Design a protein around this ligand. Structure first.
Ligand SMILES: CC1=C(O)/C(=C\N=C(/C[C@@]2(O)C(=O)Nc3ccccc32)C(=O)O)C(COP(=O)(O)O)=CN1
Ligand SMILES: CC1=C(O)/C(=C\N=C(/C[C@@]2(O)C(=O)Nc3ccccc32)C(=O)O)C(COP(=O)(O)O)=CN1
Ligand SMILES: CC1=C(O)/C(=C\N=C(/C[C@@]2(O)C(=O)Nc3ccccc32)C(=O)O)C(COP(=O)(O)O)=CN1
Ligand SMILES: CC1=C(O)/C(=C\N=C(/C[C@@]2(O)C(=O)Nc3ccccc32)C(=O)O)C(COP(=O)(O)O)=CN1
Ligand SMILES: [K+]
Ligand SMILES: [K+]
Ligand SMILES: [K+]
Ligand SMILES: [K+]
Lengths: 466, 466, 466, 466
């Protein structure tokens, strides 16, 4: 395992503490064995998400201080519009308060646009993988969320350069089965969070856009982690070995028509989202009409002006190759430390997190009893580290069936916030999980005490099966 | 006209400038003669809204700096929960990214809950007045937005203590005509923004709640400007003459079952909203379930932790009577200067803005030609001051009939942000509008070039009728 | 009295509070009848000084948080160096923690340089007027501080354009009485703080520099309030009517060899000082060697990097004419309010304060009993406003005689911080002093209880004479 | 080598870059071969000092935002006075702008206080080791700075618990040779910066103070790194095995009569100093009288109010044992890395820096040619890391004879700012120095091209002896 040095130094700190063992068992029982319902004071190292937990730079905080809080026509809206034209070559922007606000603006608009000519009678969205809020909005509007990631992603131990690729054969077959008139949009998620933060090659993005253009289908790039995807393209595609990250990004977005971005990820923010549209003014105008009731006025979209200002600076900082090398290198370090102790992970590691394969760690727990969540409650009670489940729990139920959606992967996600923790924090995380090696076969399983009908893993209360 | 000194001193300033005459004219031509589409660099003193443009305290900024950005269980969430129990005596909270986000959480939940037993086939909301995003969410869910403000609000120059009161006769008549089973909720807006920021009395709120309780109708307090309402109750109600502001607030919220609040108004913020529920845990649970896909996890709701921290501090400062006396006194000063120079305004002034009655200022322009937007565009080209219209433009159209909603009031709103402008800024505003007295009769209305189907006045472009 | 509108708006506030009469009488008795020993919590509007109490912009705060805290070679040091070459055309800078730190760097070095040549056997400094720490440092190094302001500054109610001017006749007479070999340096104080913040004309600056260069006499421009001086030269000298503020400043500093600046005044800071030398690399090197033991390393000189960062931005903002017009106009507004009620002041008012002539207000109290302090303790006890004395109390004793220095002016200084208070605060201040007209003839002098031998007026405790 | 994890996480970052070898060589040549004259833009990792380069907490920044900037009686001044009563049991404080500002306040006052009644005719100060600026102020006031560190500090490789102790025998010898009447004060530097940041035992401080009280000698605690001293006492003295850090600090300061503190070190600040006095109100009053002309008014002392607020919070954080364990453990980690590779260091490592024994590393260079400054310049050209010399160069010359002061030590100080660099930065520094093994013997010393007479090493320009 190779440690990489920060291409920065620390300017401001916040204290963390280790709760006692007795505090963690009391708090986890009060939280219904769902770590989402734990207070942050009961958590030591928080690995629940990399969304909104990143450490900003001094330049970002300065941008916030001079941010323009005007209600209409803020100076930072025009800055954000210029930055999107620079990075993606897109001509239209609509800020949003975060990623699921961006999707709530754009996806209902695309569905109504597809219905203008009586089409979308049985509407579907096709993605390499819809993450949980993305699929939830697809389903909220009466559509089906179809995931066609390459089957290589389901083989954890088997290395592959692009475990986030669309299955091209499945794309053409889904287009054939449903019909181009039923596919409201194709959503390319970069990186593929559900596959393990695994990247999509430039050729896969290029071929998906060509097949979608052949059939007149709209393509949306889910751009939460597009810089980490761009970094992997430069690292693994020989064509881009000598290109800059901004050149990789600029070629990526030639293969989409619009983007929904959670700026709480690669732009290194605590809050923020973005819609951008390449050149379709009619879809832009319709998306603006929905932004107003749902998010806010079209030049702030539910964000304070200081946050747009921080987004303009974060969009720049998130593309710096030397930061990307350290960030993804750090995730790789935690992964190599866990692999060297024989703990199975999605190999190679992605950009933002290490995903532990809990199918292999605890095969006595059937997927419907959430094996990964068993390892999570175990890791927390042992160490004070809080992680999240990316498996049957998060996947929830089929809105049409009512039964469990089939899980091909049962991951425990060690999500790493950007510029927040050091490799010494990583050593605590790795050593903590490694210490449970003689206790995995003892882990039990979980059953619902209260289950929400949508996005159940966020607030469901669980009961141990013992 | 009585000037009231600031109960604070300035700690940080932000530069503003007067753009030239030819810059403003080109800008308004560029903005489709809609001030909303102007850039802030074309605006000198910005009176477009009191929402999100407030100036925070050093204590608020300090609270942001120690804000807890944790994804789940933020320390500042529990502070906000405690704060809402202190102010309102309400047991459950859900943060939202702003007011319309909070309405999107609760209003669809109340509609579904009311229909749980096959009832509410013709669902309606009843309010003294729904503001535009409030009525928009009522109508986006397929309900009718009924407004029954007191007739005394329609008599601008005639003083009345409570121009935001419900029409108790129209309330009982509407419960009879529609049936309690079709009334999803009664929404008490404090202060009544549409009537001119005019207050609702305690006994009016008390009687509406008791009427609703008799028929089992859920009551929501739209609480954007609830402190300004509490101040007026203390000033004008002899029952609360010797009571604290917080004692008045505690009583107000005995006459509701929940609130939706835009924290960008009286809590002195640049972003933020809040849902609070008194004691119905079932409504709270369903509202949580809708918060996750639309806004964020239930302990931040689309806000950074720093913004929840500011809200806890802002909720305290906004109740300070010394600040409230100065704030509402600054609004009263601006209106008195105009009223003394013969300019018709909603008398008495509201808490957050002076409302110039343009029907009596420009009688030549019919209501359907938006008489107040003529006065606003005239004021802007003259002084670099940008105002907003509250009349037929903002009312929009009846969604079922598709035609202009009848406007009883044609206001130009000079909206004053909290703790941002001095009384010398107020003198600049007043002198500008006074200098246009010889040109009012020459102004003409404006027709539509581009009209959105919902919330038109935000992005619509206008053609001045020559 | 004419109110001038702020060329900015408020971005952050700080709460102020009126202490009860009981709190003020107890506090002033506890403070030894010296308001300097009062706590800030016992003060309402603080008019003690305009030094270090100014409100910064959002740009200054933004500069601070990206400030470079490096011990040596901070990026902001070079920004500060370039700024002084832009503004003053000076080629060397040495930061200092504030004004008296800058004098301590340069004045002892000026004395040693003159002595290295066998001169300064009976050394003296000559100024239009040394302020108290300036005069104290000259005296601390064994020199006499001679003040030769124009006698027109002693006729307070008689208008004059340049009540800070040197007396060219006294300058020539002192050069002949002492000899150029005894004059260590001439210090030009702009604006002349002791004369009432009154300006020095360009031609007066030009004549003094030419007289000194004739005799090989080093000229230091004491520059705490150089921007306010530049404003008065543009306002009152026909040669500079169409010049910019920076063109006026650039000419001002052709008439000095160096400057000592308290940046806590016109550069709008809460801390900070500056030494800048025109082209004498020898004086620079000697001053660097004294900076190290007394202030810090030569590239920060007792300032954090963030404060040097705020100085680069504040230096620019301090020169802006629209700001200088409002600030100086606010001082005049307070003066005209007091004048219109018959209160005698140094007329015209200076750039940073209104100086109430207590020699004309309480003639029953002899100057040796500090009549201005009598008016001050009375104003504070009546209203919570804290002012400061500028007369025999501040003048102190002559080091040679040990007796009271002859005072030609007894002033109560109502010192106004920049961008902190509004004209409504000015109204409260004026109304408070006006309310004392009947009690002036009954006020009583003060006697020393404890008297420091240097700068007594800061920490001395006084007894009201019975 | 044992890595200790941070008891905090990163909240804000500042970018750092590695300059090209081309830039570095030009930068050092431009800087007269003195790294002090390097711009920070030519430095990668800056180990020049731990003074004022630390990283503050979010609580410290929040304290700055609400700092009270009042000129007299700032709320933060009283919080500081209370904090010093809490920590040290001292009744009087005077804030100072940094460490040498505190020395300039107190050392002249101690000299004049001792010279009452015509004694102290040959004044001396005695310390375990006066640091450079401390000895400079002793000598600037015409005194001798006698340094009597224990002989065990001169054996770098041989471990000792208390290498900063006073040589008690030499203290008694110097009291007899000079007489108790000529000793102005004994200065107890904790930790002993010159000995390598090495601690002073509690029994050493006790016996020094008791000996001083027998002779009526005043004792000043130089307190820049007093928390790091307090940690070592608890780590190494069995009597304080179960004591809190605050109990150790409270005991340490029973053995002084006053302190001079550079709050730029253990209080975790970027600027700030402090004088505190146990109970001598006469010294307090005399020291205040000097504070006013030299630093500023007594309640701020050349600091902004925000900086006093940060000091109140830093004085608490700097005592936290869990932070001290990490901080000193990190310095120890860098030392072990060097020691394991054969690099001679002062063993054991002290609190704030690794001191490399260059008397053993480059034996071919004599002390007159500054061997450590050749290793420093070589390390900078090799890697971009900037360190500082603590040997013959910093030692300077004897004021009485004018020749090089005899140096027992030739240290290259790798100085570690607090909470700024991760252990992966420590690895970079380590490998960079280890890679210079085959070049040490090849280096040669330096000679003066420009030498200042006071504190020469800050601004001297050197020439490499070829
Ligand atoms: C690819 C994509 C996302 O990964 C994505 C957000 N992912 C998150 C944040 C999140 O709350 C979530 O949504 N699900 C989930 C599951 C477990 C923990 C935390 C979370 C994440 O931690 O992986 C969004 C939504 O953006 P948004 O949060 O700004 O509204 C859209 N697209
Ligand atoms: C009583 C109530 C509100 O007054 C209210 C908001 N009022 C606003 C903000 C607003 O954008 C708007 O909505 N319409 C409108 C019309 C003209 C200018 C600006 C605006 C206002 O300035 O008048 C909300 C929604 O809150 P939200 O903005 O945080 O989402 C809910 N209830
Ligand atoms: C022309 C000039 C100055 O006016 C000046 C400072 N003036 C001050 C600040 C001051 O503390 C003071 O010194 N005396 C005094 C008397 C009453 C109240 C407050 C004060 C002021 O309020 O007028 C300096 C010193 O600079 P410094 O404060 O940064 O050290 C040098 N030159
Ligand atoms: C024990 C003690 C100190 O160590 C101490 C300061 N030490 C510093 C800062 C310093 O500039 C220095 O003075 N010499 C020196 C030598 C090399 C690099 C940097 C420096 C340090 O990095 O070691 C002070 C003075 O305090 P001050 O800096 O706030 O004025 C007093 N006592
Ligand atoms: K967050
Ligand atoms: K805003
Ligand atoms: K200050
Ligand atoms: K610093």
């Amino acid at each position: 395992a190779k440690r990489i040095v920060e291409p920065f130094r620390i300017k401001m700190v916040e204290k963390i503490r280790v709760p006692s063992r007795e505090e963690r068992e009391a708090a986890l029982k009060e939280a219904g064995y769902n770590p989402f319902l734990l207070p942050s004071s009961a958590v030591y190292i928080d690995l629940l998400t990399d969304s909104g937990t990143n450490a900003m730079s001094d330049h970002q905080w300065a941008a916030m201080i001079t941010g323009d809080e005007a209600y209409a026509g803020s100076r930072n809206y025009y800055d954000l519009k210029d930055k999107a034209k620079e990075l993606f070559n897109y001509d239209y922007i609509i800020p949003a308060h975060q990623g699921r606000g961006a999707e709530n603006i754009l996806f209902p608009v695309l569905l109504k646009y597809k219905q203008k000519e009586g089409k979308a009678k049985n509407p579907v969205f096709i993605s390499n993988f819809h993450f949980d809020t993305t699929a939830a909005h697809v389903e909220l509007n009466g559509c089906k969320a179809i995931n066609i990631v390459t089957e290589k992603a389901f083989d954890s131990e088997t290395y592959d350069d692009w475990k986030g690729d669309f299955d091209i054969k499945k794309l053409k077959e889904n287009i054939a089965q449903h019909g181009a008139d039923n596919i409201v949009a194709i959503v390319s998620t970069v990186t593929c969070n559900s596959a393990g933060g695994q990247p999509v090659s430039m050729s896969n993005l290029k071929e998906v856009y060509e097949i979608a253009k052949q059939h007149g289908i709209f393509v949306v790039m889910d751009s939460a982690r597009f810089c980490e995807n761009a970094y992997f393209i430069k690292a693994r595609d020989p064509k881009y070995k000598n290109a800059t990250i901004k050149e990789v990004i600029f070629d990526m977005y030639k293969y989409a028509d619009a983007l929904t971005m959670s700026a709480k990820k690669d732009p290194l923010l605590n809050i923020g989202g973005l819609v951008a549209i390449r050149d379709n003014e009619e879809i832009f105008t319709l998306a603006r009409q929905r932004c107003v009731p749902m998010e806010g006025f079209v030049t702030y979209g539910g964000l304070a002006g200081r946050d747009m200002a921080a987004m303009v600076q974060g969009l720049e900082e998130g593309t710096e190759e030397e930061y990307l090398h350290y960030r993804i290198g750090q995730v790789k370090y935690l992964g190599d430390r866990l692999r060297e102790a024989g703990i199975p992970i999605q190999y190679p590691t992605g950009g933002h997190a290490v995903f532990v394969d809990c199918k292999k760690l605890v095969p006595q727990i059937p997927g419907d009893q959430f094996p990964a969540q068993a390892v999570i409650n175990a890791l927390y009670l042992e160490s004070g580290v809080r992680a999240v489940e990316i498996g049957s729990f998060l996947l929830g139920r089929d809105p049409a069936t009512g039964e469990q959606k089939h899980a091909d992967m049962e991951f425990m996600r060690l999500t790493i916030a950007r510029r927040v923790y050091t490799n010494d924090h990583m050593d605590y995380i790795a050593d903590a999980l490694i210490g449970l090696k003689e206790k995995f076969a003892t882990l039990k399983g979980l059953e619902f005490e209260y289950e929400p009908p949508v996005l159940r893993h966020f607030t469901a209360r669980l009961k141990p099966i013992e």
